[PDB]
Protein backbone atom coordinates (compact mmCIF):
# COMPACT_ATOMS: atom_id res chain seq x y z
CA UNK A 1 0.00 0.00 0.00
CA UNK A 2 1.13 3.20 -0.61
CA UNK A 3 1.53 6.24 2.05
CA UNK A 4 -1.77 7.62 2.46
CA UNK A 5 -0.55 11.21 3.75
CA UNK A 6 2.34 13.38 3.14
CA UNK A 7 2.90 16.42 4.94
CA UNK A 8 4.73 19.98 3.69
CA UNK A 9 5.73 22.87 5.66
CA UNK A 10 7.60 23.86 8.93
CA UNK A 11 10.20 25.68 10.24
CA UNK A 12 11.26 28.29 12.79
CA UNK A 13 8.85 31.38 13.13
CA UNK A 14 8.31 34.27 15.97
CA UNK A 15 6.07 34.32 18.14
CA UNK A 16 3.01 36.61 16.93
CA UNK A 17 3.94 35.30 13.10
CA UNK A 18 1.71 33.01 11.32
CA UNK A 19 2.15 29.74 9.46
CA UNK A 20 -0.32 27.07 7.04
CA UNK A 21 1.24 23.61 7.14
CA UNK A 22 -0.14 21.08 4.35
CA UNK A 23 -1.40 17.60 4.00
CA UNK A 24 -1.94 15.50 0.89
CA UNK A 25 -4.65 12.82 0.79
CA UNK A 26 -5.23 9.55 -0.87
CA UNK A 27 -8.31 9.96 -3.16
CA UNK A 28 -9.67 7.12 -1.35
CA UNK A 29 -8.74 8.51 2.61
CA UNK A 30 -9.54 12.31 1.23
CA UNK A 31 -12.99 11.23 0.95
CA UNK A 32 -13.29 8.61 3.44
CA UNK A 33 -11.98 10.19 6.45
CA UNK A 34 -11.88 12.67 9.27
CA UNK A 35 -9.16 14.64 8.64
CA UNK A 36 -6.95 16.34 10.98
CA UNK A 37 -4.21 17.24 12.87
CA UNK A 38 -2.32 16.44 15.86
CA UNK A 39 0.65 18.17 17.88
CA UNK A 40 3.14 16.61 19.73
CA UNK A 41 5.24 19.07 22.37
CA UNK A 42 8.66 18.62 23.93
CA UNK A 43 8.16 15.04 26.40
CA UNK A 44 4.13 15.48 26.24
CA UNK A 45 2.06 12.87 24.64
CA UNK A 46 0.41 14.19 21.61
CA UNK A 47 -2.67 16.24 21.38
CA UNK A 48 -5.90 17.20 18.90
CA UNK A 49 -5.45 19.99 17.71
CA UNK A 50 -8.09 20.37 14.28
CA UNK A 51 -10.56 18.38 12.39
CA UNK A 52 -12.42 18.68 9.19
CA UNK A 53 -15.19 16.75 8.12
CA UNK A 54 -14.69 13.73 5.79
CA UNK A 55 -14.45 14.64 1.90
CA UNK A 56 -14.38 18.70 2.32
CA UNK A 57 -15.42 20.18 -1.21
CA UNK A 58 -17.52 22.55 -1.16
CA UNK A 59 -19.09 22.85 2.45
CA UNK A 60 -17.36 21.25 5.61
CA UNK A 61 -17.54 21.35 9.45
CA UNK A 62 -14.28 21.98 11.27
CA UNK A 63 -13.53 21.57 15.15
CA UNK A 64 -11.06 22.93 17.08
CA UNK A 65 -8.81 22.53 21.13
CA UNK A 66 -9.84 25.23 22.89
CA UNK A 67 -6.30 26.20 23.12
CA UNK A 68 -6.25 26.88 19.80
CA UNK A 69 -9.29 28.56 18.91
CA UNK A 70 -9.73 31.05 16.88
CA UNK A 71 -5.89 31.70 15.92
CA UNK A 72 -5.71 28.07 14.30
CA UNK A 73 -8.20 27.16 11.22
CA UNK A 74 -8.49 24.17 9.39
CA UNK A 75 -9.24 23.84 5.20
CA UNK A 76 -9.17 22.01 2.41
CA UNK A 77 -8.38 21.74 -1.40
CA UNK A 78 -10.34 19.20 -3.32
CA UNK A 79 -8.92 19.31 -6.57
CA UNK A 80 -5.30 18.29 -4.92
CA UNK A 81 -6.59 16.24 -2.33
CA UNK A 82 -4.83 18.17 0.62
CA UNK A 83 -5.63 19.67 3.72
CA UNK A 84 -4.25 22.98 5.09
CA UNK A 85 -3.36 23.64 8.98
CA UNK A 86 -3.52 27.54 9.36
CA UNK A 87 -1.44 28.89 12.69
CA UNK A 88 -1.99 32.68 13.16
CA UNK A 89 -0.39 34.90 16.29
CA UNK A 90 1.67 31.71 17.20
CA UNK A 91 3.04 31.27 20.90
CA UNK A 92 6.61 29.54 22.25
CA UNK A 93 3.85 26.91 23.59
CA UNK A 94 3.07 25.94 20.25
CA UNK A 95 6.31 24.87 19.36
CA UNK A 96 5.88 21.15 18.47
CA UNK A 97 6.02 18.69 15.97
CA UNK A 98 2.59 18.41 14.29
CA UNK A 99 0.88 15.16 12.76
CA UNK A 100 -1.73 14.90 10.38
CA UNK A 101 -4.56 12.66 11.00
CA UNK A 102 -7.36 10.42 9.16
CA UNK A 103 -9.91 8.26 11.09
CA UNK A 104 -12.15 6.51 8.62
CA UNK A 105 -14.81 5.60 11.00
CA UNK A 106 -15.21 9.21 11.49
CA UNK A 107 -17.50 11.40 8.92
CA UNK A 108 -18.41 14.79 10.44
CA UNK A 109 -15.25 17.17 12.59
CA UNK A 110 -15.18 16.69 15.83
CA UNK A 111 -12.25 15.54 18.43
CA UNK A 112 -10.33 12.40 17.04
CA UNK A 113 -8.81 10.10 19.55
CA UNK A 114 -4.89 9.44 19.65
CA UNK A 115 -5.66 5.74 19.44
CA UNK A 116 -8.81 5.87 16.75
CA UNK A 117 -6.10 7.32 14.18
CA UNK A 118 -6.07 4.97 11.36
CA UNK A 119 -2.92 6.72 9.56
CA UNK A 120 -0.23 9.28 9.77
CA UNK A 121 1.53 11.36 7.95
CA UNK A 122 5.41 12.07 9.33
CA UNK A 123 5.30 15.00 11.62
CA UNK A 124 7.14 18.25 10.87
CA UNK A 125 8.49 20.10 13.16
CA UNK A 126 7.23 23.78 13.68
CA UNK A 127 9.25 26.29 16.61
CA UNK A 128 8.00 29.77 17.51
CA UNK A 129 10.60 31.67 19.32
CA UNK A 130 9.81 34.00 21.96
CA UNK B 1 0.02 13.91 30.12
CA UNK B 2 3.78 12.92 29.82
CA UNK B 3 4.48 11.39 26.58
CA UNK B 4 4.30 7.86 26.62
CA UNK B 5 6.82 6.36 24.13
CA UNK B 6 10.28 7.83 23.85
CA UNK B 7 12.70 6.06 21.39
CA UNK B 8 16.62 5.46 20.29
CA UNK B 9 19.07 4.58 17.89
CA UNK B 10 18.83 4.95 14.08
CA UNK B 11 21.56 5.74 11.08
CA UNK B 12 23.29 5.04 8.28
CA UNK B 13 24.53 1.35 7.94
CA UNK B 14 26.01 -0.93 5.36
CA UNK B 15 24.57 -3.95 4.06
CA UNK B 16 25.28 -7.14 6.43
CA UNK B 17 25.87 -5.40 8.85
CA UNK B 18 23.58 -4.54 12.45
CA UNK B 19 21.95 -2.00 14.07
CA UNK B 20 19.51 -1.64 17.51
CA UNK B 21 16.68 0.48 17.89
CA UNK B 22 15.25 0.90 21.46
CA UNK B 23 11.94 2.19 23.10
CA UNK B 24 11.39 3.09 27.16
CA UNK B 25 7.71 3.55 27.83
CA UNK B 26 5.98 4.85 31.14
CA UNK B 27 5.51 2.28 33.54
CA UNK B 28 1.75 2.06 33.02
CA UNK B 29 1.39 1.75 29.40
CA UNK B 30 4.50 -0.91 29.51
CA UNK B 31 2.78 -3.03 31.84
CA UNK B 32 -0.60 -2.65 29.80
CA UNK B 33 0.15 -2.43 26.51
CA UNK B 34 1.89 -4.99 23.83
CA UNK B 35 4.52 -3.83 22.70
CA UNK B 36 5.91 -3.72 18.72
CA UNK B 37 7.96 -2.03 16.08
CA UNK B 38 6.68 -0.94 12.62
CA UNK B 39 8.43 0.75 9.79
CA UNK B 40 7.81 2.72 6.85
CA UNK B 41 9.46 2.53 3.77
CA UNK B 42 9.94 6.01 1.12
CA UNK B 43 6.57 6.37 -0.27
CA UNK B 44 5.02 3.00 1.43
CA UNK B 45 2.47 3.11 4.97
CA UNK B 46 3.88 1.38 7.88
CA UNK B 47 3.81 -2.29 8.10
CA UNK B 48 4.31 -4.51 10.90
CA UNK B 49 7.83 -5.70 11.77
CA UNK B 50 7.35 -7.63 15.86
CA UNK B 51 5.57 -7.63 18.66
CA UNK B 52 6.39 -8.69 22.00
CA UNK B 53 3.98 -9.60 25.34
CA UNK B 54 4.90 -10.28 29.08
CA UNK B 55 3.80 -13.86 30.42
CA UNK B 56 3.61 -14.96 33.62
CA UNK B 57 7.14 -15.00 35.47
CA UNK B 58 10.10 -13.76 32.88
CA UNK B 59 8.47 -14.59 30.30
CA UNK B 60 7.57 -13.29 26.90
CA UNK B 61 6.04 -14.21 23.84
CA UNK B 62 7.39 -12.51 20.87
CA UNK B 63 5.57 -12.90 17.19
CA UNK B 64 7.47 -11.64 14.02
CA UNK B 65 6.35 -10.58 10.43
CA UNK B 66 7.55 -12.96 7.24
CA UNK B 67 9.87 -10.45 6.16
CA UNK B 68 12.13 -9.97 9.24
CA UNK B 69 11.85 -14.01 10.38
CA UNK B 70 15.54 -15.06 11.72
CA UNK B 71 16.96 -11.82 11.32
CA UNK B 72 15.79 -9.26 13.67
CA UNK B 73 15.64 -10.31 17.51
CA UNK B 74 13.12 -8.51 19.63
CA UNK B 75 13.36 -8.20 23.43
CA UNK B 76 11.81 -5.98 26.57
CA UNK B 77 13.68 -5.41 30.20
CA UNK B 78 10.81 -4.90 32.67
CA UNK B 79 13.40 -3.10 35.26
CA UNK B 80 13.81 -0.24 32.47
CA UNK B 81 10.50 -0.18 31.19
CA UNK B 82 12.18 -0.58 27.80
CA UNK B 83 11.87 -2.60 24.60
CA UNK B 84 14.70 -3.32 22.10
CA UNK B 85 14.87 -5.04 18.30
CA UNK B 86 18.39 -6.10 17.41
CA UNK B 87 18.67 -6.00 13.43
CA UNK B 88 20.99 -8.23 11.80
CA UNK B 89 21.85 -9.42 8.11
CA UNK B 90 20.60 -5.54 7.29
CA UNK B 91 19.77 -5.04 3.01
CA UNK B 92 18.83 -2.05 1.61
CA UNK B 93 15.36 -3.06 1.29
CA UNK B 94 15.49 -2.61 5.58
CA UNK B 95 15.90 1.17 4.52
CA UNK B 96 13.24 2.67 6.18
CA UNK B 97 11.90 5.25 9.47
CA UNK B 98 11.44 3.16 11.95
CA UNK B 99 8.72 3.13 14.84
CA UNK B 100 7.36 1.87 18.51
CA UNK B 101 4.12 0.75 18.97
CA UNK B 102 1.89 -0.03 22.34
CA UNK B 103 -1.42 -2.00 21.86
CA UNK B 104 -3.23 -1.71 24.70
CA UNK B 105 -6.04 -3.91 23.95
CA UNK B 106 -4.20 -6.86 22.89
CA UNK B 107 -2.60 -9.34 25.38
CA UNK B 108 -0.54 -11.72 23.23
CA UNK B 109 2.20 -10.89 20.72
CA UNK B 110 0.35 -11.60 17.35
CA UNK B 111 0.03 -9.58 13.84
CA UNK B 112 -0.54 -5.82 14.71
CA UNK B 113 -2.65 -3.49 12.56
CA UNK B 114 -1.23 0.15 12.58
CA UNK B 115 -4.63 1.41 13.35
CA UNK B 116 -5.01 -0.91 16.44
CA UNK B 117 -2.04 1.18 17.72
CA UNK B 118 -2.99 3.43 21.31
CA UNK B 119 0.71 5.14 20.90
CA UNK B 120 4.17 5.40 19.09
CA UNK B 121 7.41 6.43 19.11
CA UNK B 122 8.46 9.49 17.05
CA UNK B 123 10.15 8.06 14.04
CA UNK B 124 13.54 7.36 13.59
CA UNK B 125 15.84 6.92 10.36
CA UNK B 126 17.66 3.69 9.43
CA UNK B 127 19.39 3.80 6.22
CA UNK B 128 20.99 0.30 4.74
CA UNK B 129 23.68 1.08 1.73
CA UNK B 130 25.15 -1.30 -1.11
Known amino acids: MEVQ ?5 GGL ?7 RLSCTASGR ?8 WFRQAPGKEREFVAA ?3 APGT ?3 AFYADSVRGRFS ?6 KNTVYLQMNS ?11 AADLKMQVAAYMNQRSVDYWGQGTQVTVSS
Open 5 to 9: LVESG
Open 13 to 19: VQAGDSL
Open 29 to 36: TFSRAVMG
Open 52 to 54: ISA
Open 59 to 61: AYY
Open 74 to 79: IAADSA
Open 90 to 100: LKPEDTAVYYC
